[PDB]
Every structure is written in C-alpha cells, then in structure tokens.
C-alpha cells in the first residue's frame, strides 16, 4: 500500500521461496564485484552506451559543456549557419558544431548548429507544458460519451405513490441511483476540454527538447533522407547500414525530413516517406518547431450542434515534433534541409527578442 | 496559455467522486475503474496483460486487447509459453519450478 499504512509489511513470509534458482542466481562476492544493473543514482532506465548507443564525438560529460565539436576541425570542410547567429536569453553561450553523416554512414563535412535552436538550455517546467499539452490533446474525444438521466427511456410517471409503504420514496427511476440509470452530469465530448497552446510556449518548449536531445548526444545530422526505391526493405536496408534501431523494443528514431542542404523542401521526400512505413518504433515529422495560432469559434456556447470538444478548434497536427515523441524515440535524425527551415522560420523571432540597444547594432553588424 | 490540465492526461480515470471538475473525465456509469477488480478481493491476473488506451506495439496471444478471456483462442497450446524476445513473438516450453537438491529446478510443465 502506502508506506505508512499497516498493510505494508504484511506478507512477513512467503514472498520468496527459500531456495535459489539453480540457473540465474548467485551469491554476493564482495566490494570488488560488479553487479548487473547496480548504480549509485536512481536511474529508472539504466541504459548504458551499449544498449542505447549514442552518436556524437564525445560521451556526454560534466566536464564538457556539450558533446560535440567546439571548434571546426581542420580535416573536414566546415559549413557555417544559414542565417547569422545571435545569443539570446536562455542560450548556451558556446559554439556548437555537429558532424554531418552521409547515407553510407561515414562522416562527410561538419555543420554548425544555431544556439537559439539547439542551444536553448532545457528546464523541466517548459517541457512539462509541452508534454501534458500533447498527452491531453492526443486522446480520442469522441469516445468520451455517456448516458444522461434524460436519455434512459423509461416512463415518466411516479412509479409507485408514496404514502403508507415501507418502500423508498421513488418516482421516475431513470436516476443515477439505479442499475439502468445514467448520471446527471455525464461525460460527453462537447464538455471535455481541448487545451489551447500559445505559439511562444510551443516554440520555446520544442527548442528546449531539441537541445535536450543534443546534450544527450542523441542528435544526428544527415545529408538527405532518400531511398533507392519506394519499398520498405530498402528502408530497412538503410536502417541496417546506419545502425539505426527501429525494432519496437529497441530505442527508435525520429526523422525530421527537410530534404538536402542544396534542395530543402517542406514536403516529404516521396521515396523515403513511402517505404518509411514499418511496424517498428519510428516516426517521421514535419520540419517545423512552430505552430499556427489556435482559435475558438465557440469561445462561449454559440454553436450548439457542435460535437467537438470545447477548446482550440485547431489542435496541433499529430505528425509535428513534440516532447512525447522525442522522449519515446531516442535517436533524433535531422536533415540539413530541416536545419535550414528551422533557422529561417525562427530567425525574425529570435531577432524580435533582443533588448533594443542590441537590436540597433543588427543592421550595422550585417 | 493556462497549462494543459494535468488530471486530464488520461493516465487517470477515477471513479466519480464528490470532488471533481467539469473537465475531469471519470468512468462510465456502472463500469468499474480497474478491470480485474470484479470484487474487492479480486487478484491481479498473472501473465495476462490488458492493453488499454493505445493500440499495442506487440500483442501476445495470451493477453487481452478489445477482448475477453476466450481460452481456446488465447493460448492455443497450453504446454507452450509465449514471450517477447528481441522485439518478436516467441514460444518456449512452459516450465514448472520444483525444489530438488535445495535448489529450484525447471521441469516440463505439461508432463
């Protein structure tokens, strides 16, 4: 039960059979003995770097601010950011440079990430606002229906007159008291809330999720997401070559497909997107961390034959990027086209944030 | 810009209390909150999972999804045992545990 209740500490015997299993079990040798799973911190998921492998140059550490190249390394071509870079409030205040992978899995040129996007340092309250938004939004609201007292179909009459009987005082037994009845205030979709999100919070929370992925070394940048044929096993071929793990049980992959550096697209690359349907753990999302402003055309009651929920009539579409799917799939794969689109659509946003004495030097600084 | 109500995250469908909200979704009238709870002393079924909410990623044969316990369908072979290994459905042989030399030995369940 709860730790405090006397129910806890029941089962003073029997919980174990006293006899070891003759296979798996063993005695504790001493302090020099490495126990499987044993770790000094409360890790709910005790993944090491063998089970949930990471790609970045360095295994993320307290000594390193982040696990990527801090300065462009002389043996690889270095591409600078698409738009110039300004350091705003919650940004890392450091150079972040990530290697770009080919589709044959060797490294090709190195590319610099924008600290306003991949450098926004994560703090849990914001990620919370994001996540609960998602999990509430993603229910099926049409199934939340239930029967109400007026919906029951009995006769409306006093079913027996109350005077001298020892019976209960009853009329019209279609109430909630009765096995066949239904409630006064039942559940039904139009009374269930769909939360509004504000574009600011969606922006900031998403960017912190990206940065969280980057600080864990779970981030990977790629030339193009492309297949030879639209088929599935070409996609599974690809996934085998890049050591992406798409099995249901293994840590999955989250694809942001933007197209390549030279030819960025809003649209999914057809060949990839078609073969990308595979029963395992993987997802493909649009290359935007923003969202349209949400609106309500019954903010009061006005339209009564609305089925709907109450709330934003414009909820974030499912294939977008969010905290939930960033948590559930570990390796996040982003195409350069998507990098470019992010930087571009976020640019004037990040500019409008700056304090006015800085903003005035912007045209002078180029 | 009020954060999404946390109670509504779906992890929770309590049974219709005194206190609640207009946006709190409680369960249907006349349907209990925990499925295996037919009585108050009713036990958690052992290896039997009930997938709930989302579609399951892997669906064992001996588990429940939009279903009832149908036994001929649920375990086709009783002498066999079902488990998820390396993200696949797999079937070993059911073993029973028996104390022997002071240790616990696995023997074939069926015979």
């Amino acid at each position: 039960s709860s730790i405090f209740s006397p129910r806890y500490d029941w089962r003073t015997s029997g919980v174990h059979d006293i006899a070891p299993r003759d296979e798996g079990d063993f005695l504790y040798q001493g302090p020099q003995h490495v126990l499987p799973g044993a770790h000094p911190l409360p890790l709910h998921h005790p993944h090491n770097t063998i089970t949930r492998p990471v790609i970045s140059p360095y295994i993320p550490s307290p000594q390193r601010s982040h696990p990527y190249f801090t300065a462009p390394l002389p043996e690889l071509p270095h591409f600078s950011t698409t738009k110039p870079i300004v350091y705003t409030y919650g940004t890392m205040k450091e150079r972040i440079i990530a290697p770009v992978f080919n589709l044959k899995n060797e490294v090709i040129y190195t590319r610099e990430l924008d600290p306003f996007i991949f450098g926004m340092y994560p703090e849990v309250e914001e990620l919370s606002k994001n996540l609960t938004y998602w999990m509430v939004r993603c229910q099926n609201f049409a199934s939340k229906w239930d029967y109400e007292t007026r919906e029951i179909w009995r006769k409306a009459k006093k079913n027996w007159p109350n005077t001298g009987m020892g019976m209960p005082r009853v009329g019209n037994r279609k109430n909630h008291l009765y096995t066949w009845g239904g409630r006064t205030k039942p559940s039904k979709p139009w009374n269930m809330l769909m939360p509004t999100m504000d574009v600011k919070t969606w922006s900031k929370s998403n960017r912190m999720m990206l940065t969280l992925k980057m600080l864990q070394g779970r981030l990977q940048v790629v030339d193009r997401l492309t297949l030879e044929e639209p088929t599935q096993e070409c996609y599974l071929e690809l996934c085998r070559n890049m050591s992406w793990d798409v099995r249901h049980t293994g840590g999955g992959v989250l694809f942001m497909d933007g197209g390549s550096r030279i030819t960025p697209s809003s649209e999914f690359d057809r060949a990839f997107f078609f073969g990308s349907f595979f029963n395992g753990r993987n997802k493909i999302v649009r290359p935007t961390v923003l969202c349209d402003e949400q609106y309500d055309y019954n903010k009061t009651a006005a339209k009564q034959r609305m089925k709907g929920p109450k709330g934003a009539k414009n909820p974030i579409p499912i294939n977008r990027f969010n905290a939930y799917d960033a948590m559930k799939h570990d390796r996040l794969v982003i195409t350069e086209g998507a990098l470019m689109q992010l930087e571009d659509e976020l640019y004037e946003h990040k500019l409008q944030i700056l304090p006015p004495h800085i903003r005035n030097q912007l045209p002078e600084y180029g | 810009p009020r954060p999404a109500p946390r109670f509504a995250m779906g992890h929770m469908l309590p049974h219709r209390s005194n206190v609640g909200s207009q946006f709190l979704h409680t369960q249907r009238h006349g349907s209990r909150s925990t499925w295996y709870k037919k009585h108050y002393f009713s036990l958690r079924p052992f290896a039997i999972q009930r997938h709930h909410g989302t579609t399951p990623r892997i669906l064992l044969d001996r588990s429940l999804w939009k279903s009832l316990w149908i036994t001929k369908l649920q375990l086709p072979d009783i002498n066999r045992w079902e488990r998820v290994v390396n993200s696949r459905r797999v079937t070993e042989d059911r073993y029973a545990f028996v104390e022997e030399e002071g240790v616990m030995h696995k023997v074939n369940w069926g015979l």
């Binding site: 179909w153 096995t179 066949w180 009564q304 609305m306 | -």
Partner: peptide, 22 residues
C-alpha cells in the same frame, strides 16, 4: 448506462451542448 439494458437499447432523447450565460 449496461449491455442487456432494455432502457438504453430503445433510443430516447439525446442531450445537446447546453448554451452558456451572457
């Protein structure tokens, strides 16, 4: 409302979304 119910098996009324105050 129960599966076998004769009550809800014959459809009675269906409550709308009720209108809010000024």
């Amino acid at each position: 409302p129960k599966m076998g119910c004769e009550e809800i098996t014959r459809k009675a009324r269906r409550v709308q979304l009720q209108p809010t105050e000024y």
